[PDB]
Write a protein that binds this ligand. Structure first.
Ligand SMILES: Nc1nc2c(ncn2[C@@H]2O[C@H](COP(=O)(O)OP(=O)(O)CP(=O)(O)O)[C@@H](O)[C@H]2O)c(=O)[nH]1
Ligand SMILES: [Cl-]
Ligand SMILES: [Mg+2]
Length: 726
């Protein structure tokens, strides 16, 4: 019965000791979703298709012909270990690089990770990505080597060849961890003997581990015989997949009691000795509320659902919380937990749990909900990759113009790695995302779920603007000519750029804490001390001496900074990589003369003129491309990538197969999937990995800038410094 399950989960909810919050991560197609569905079945939970909310849902044959996971799915299992019941919360995540946003949002909510590796392919590009994403969040990883059934029969190899090849995978994962966090590699290391690694077949519901093997007697000899004599069904009775893997989850992944104090080191810049600081570290149900929202979605009946991680306190219907950056308190309607594949309403929820909540009218992804309005909010959920592809979207019928604006707004709310620009003048809206497939899925769902016929344009790349040298001081001047600002500008140093990109500094930190981090990474003491604003991948530094009225005028200066960052002076593309320094300023004494109408245009104009004096340039995004190919088709694949402005970084040969490691610009990778096939008689297997932005060749700057200004309908003239400081 489901009668019994509800009481079991509700009981365990109040016992943080017996909770595991975990995510399943892997390179695409390595077996994440087969593993999640079959752990859920072995535990005795009902399957997703029989869920109450799914009764009236047809199986769209197009979205499931690819079978690819597109969105994260939350489930929970009750599992019995050494005579005690544990609540395991699980998040199954997408593999495809275009949906890496869902992976970062999931890592924010869990405390442990099962990394799945294909025994045939071994470790692949996104195996590195997901491992890095977990360690950045202080999540503990363990290893499950999958598809071992395919390794045995397709390769017809020795038992000793099987020990070697599987140890080869374990070694590769250990090297990645050592490189990524050398200080604590001794603690995170995966040892096979203790039980931190498991092997099996998710598809066929068996798995083995060393503590289980000696506690059972089965050897590698018996495992090979089972698979070659067509008896994998009997190997699953002796070594059940959920038994081995759920025991390992309970034995080596942390409960909220051991892990919440380590998560808060990287996700919160508040006082760790404060009331909320230690009550989060205590998983204290009687503390103030601290709710970390990681997902927004919509329910046909209940409305909007906010999902995330409760770190301190209790929630129930009618309790009021503030949303970070919003003035009015929101009131809770329903609180719920995931039990199997369903979301069920409970009377109360407590710290330590993954929770779902309705009524928070102002919630968004990354929000903090708290009892006290003044709590320092949790760090943002940063995806380490910016949007690089854009299409224009228009409603097919003009009678649908408002509904499409509504539909597009909810869509960007639910997936924040999308950027939506709405233009109710032209009726044409830009939609920017991580790749062509990302945009394809968005368009297909607006037309299928929201019932709004749309037309989309051909995809185009999204550039960035930056500077290449130092310039200044440059003077910006308010329209009434009373206020003046003196600005220098130059590129961020790469070490400082990484601190900003990784969220290791913020203006929420204590001053001495932030300054020591900056100085340890190169910055002079005076610049570390004067930093006042961090936006995107740029910083603003106040170097002034002590100017009356500057402090209350600074927010207006920073709004001018932000307007330039949203679209730069070459082509109105987003800006990255700047260190902007305020060296001096003249201000009028009367507030009526130094308001928004005067300060924002002067700040805006000094920054834009300094940029054009500092060698402004465009950057275009580049991908790293891995091409697996048989010897015969090597030359074909080589020509095809070098004909798309591709450069070869390395080449590796294992027997008959060569792996080509190249880099190429996004702008030239449209149509690659079908061109790489027609060029390698269909044998090429490839994957990508975002590399970075690189400057466009100085001979291509003016052509590229003018083409963007054309497409955007701006004046077809190169900007000069005299256009701003006038
Ligand atoms: N032979 C074999 N095939 C398996 C095993 N586990 C999964 N597969 C197969 O691999 C393919 C992908 O499995 P799936 O669970 O969807 O992997 P995924 O990592 O979730 C795919 P995505 O990254 O898109 O979310 C399927 O065809 C599935 O049947 C296994 O243990 N053995
Ligand atoms: Cl710097
Ligand atoms: Mg999947």
């Amino acid at each position: 019965r489901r009668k019994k399950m509800v009481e079991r989960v509700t009981t365990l909810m109040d016992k943080p000791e017996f909770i595991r919050n975990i995510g399943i991560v892997a390179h695409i197609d390595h077996g994440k979703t087969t593993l999640s569905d079959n752990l859920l079945a072995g535990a005795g939970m009902i399957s997703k298709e029989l869920a109450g909310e799914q009764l009236f849902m047809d199986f769209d044959e197009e979205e499931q012909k690819r079978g690819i996971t597109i969105d994260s799915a939350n489930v929970s299992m009750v599992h019995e270990y050494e005579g005690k019941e544990y609540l395991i919360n699980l998040i199954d995540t997408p593999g495809h690089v275009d949906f890496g946003g869902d992976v970062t949002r999931a890592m924010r909510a869990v405390d442990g990770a099962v990394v799945v590796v294909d025994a045939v392919e071994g470790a692949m590009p996104q195996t590195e990505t997901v491992l890095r994403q977990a360690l950045r969040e202080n999540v503990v990883p363990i290893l499950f080597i999958n598809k071992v059934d395919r390794l045995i029969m397709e390769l017809k190899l020795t038992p000793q060849d099987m020990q070697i090849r599987l140890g080869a995978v374990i070694d590769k994962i250990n090297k990645l961890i050592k490189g990524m966090k050398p200080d604590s590699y001794d603690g995170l290391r995966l040892d096979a003997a203790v039980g931190k690694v498991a092997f099996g077949s998710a598809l066929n519901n068996w798995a083995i581990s060393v503590p289980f093997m000696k506690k059972t007697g089965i050897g590698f000899k018996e495992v090979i015989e089972y698979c070659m004599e067509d008896q994998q069904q009997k190997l699953a009775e002796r070594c059940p997949l959920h038994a081995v893997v759920n025991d390992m989850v309970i034995r080596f992944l942390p409960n909220p009691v051991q892990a919440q104090k380590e998560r808060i080191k990287v996700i919160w810049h508040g006082d760790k000795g404060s009331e909320i600081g230690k009550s989060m570290a205590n998983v204290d149900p009687n503390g103030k509320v601290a709710l970390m929202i990681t997902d927004i979605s919509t329910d046909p009946h209940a409305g909007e659902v906010a999902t995330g991680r409760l770190f301190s306190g209790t929630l129930e219907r009618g309790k009021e919380v503030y949303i970070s950056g919003m003035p009015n308190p929101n009131r809770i309607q329903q609180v719920g937990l995931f039990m199997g594949p369903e979301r069920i309403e409970v009377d109360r929820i407590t710290a330590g749990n993954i929770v779902a909540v309705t009524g928070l009218a102002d919630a968004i992804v990354g929000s903090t909900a708290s009892t006290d309005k003044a709590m320092v909010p949790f760090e943002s959920i940063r995806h380490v990759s910016e949007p690089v592809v854009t299409v224009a979207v228009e409603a097919k019928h003009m009678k649908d113009l408002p509904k499409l604006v509504e539909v597009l707004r909810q869509v960007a709310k639910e997936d924040p790695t999308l950027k939506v620009t709405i233009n109710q003048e032209t009726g044409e809206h830009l939609l920017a995302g991580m790749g062509e497939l990302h945009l394809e899925i968005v368009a297909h769902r607006i037309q299928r779920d929201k019932h709004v016929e749309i037309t989309t344009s051909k995809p185009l790349v999204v550039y960035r603007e930056t500077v290449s040298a130092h310039a200044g001081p440059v003077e910006g001047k308010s329209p009434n000519r009373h206020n003046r600002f003196y600005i220098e500008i130059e590129p961020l140093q790469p070490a400082i750029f990484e601190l900003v990109r990784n969220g290791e500094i913020s203006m929420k930190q204590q001053e001495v804490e932030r300054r020591d981090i900056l100085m340890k990474a190169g910055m002079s003491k005076e610049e570390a001390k004067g930093i006042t604003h961090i936006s995107e991948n740029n910083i603003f530094i106040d170097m002034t001496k002590g100017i009356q009225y500057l402090n209350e005028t600074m927010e207006l200066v920073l709004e001018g900074f932000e307007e330039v960052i949203k679209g730069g002076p070459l082509s109105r593309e987003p800006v990255m990589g700047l260190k902007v320094k305020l060296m001096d300023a003249k201000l009028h004494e009367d507030s009526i003369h130094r308001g928004p109408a005067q300060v924002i245009p002067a700040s805006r104009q000094a920054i834009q003129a300094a940029m054009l004096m500092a060698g402004a340039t465009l950057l275009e995004p580049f991908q790293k491309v891995f091409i697996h190919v048989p010897q015969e088709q090597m030359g074909g694949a080589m020509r095809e990538i070098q004909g798309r402005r591709g450069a070869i970084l390395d080449m590796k040969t294992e027997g008959d197969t060569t792996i080509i490691e190249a880099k190429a610009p996004v702008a030239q990778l449209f149509g690659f999937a079908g061109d790489i096939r027609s060029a390698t008689e269909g044998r090429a297997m490839w994957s990508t990995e975002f590399l970075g932005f690189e400057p466009i060749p100085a001979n291509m700057l003016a052509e590229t800038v003018m083409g963007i200004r054309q497409r955007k309908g701006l004046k077809l003239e190169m900007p000069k410094p005299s256009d701003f400081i006038s």
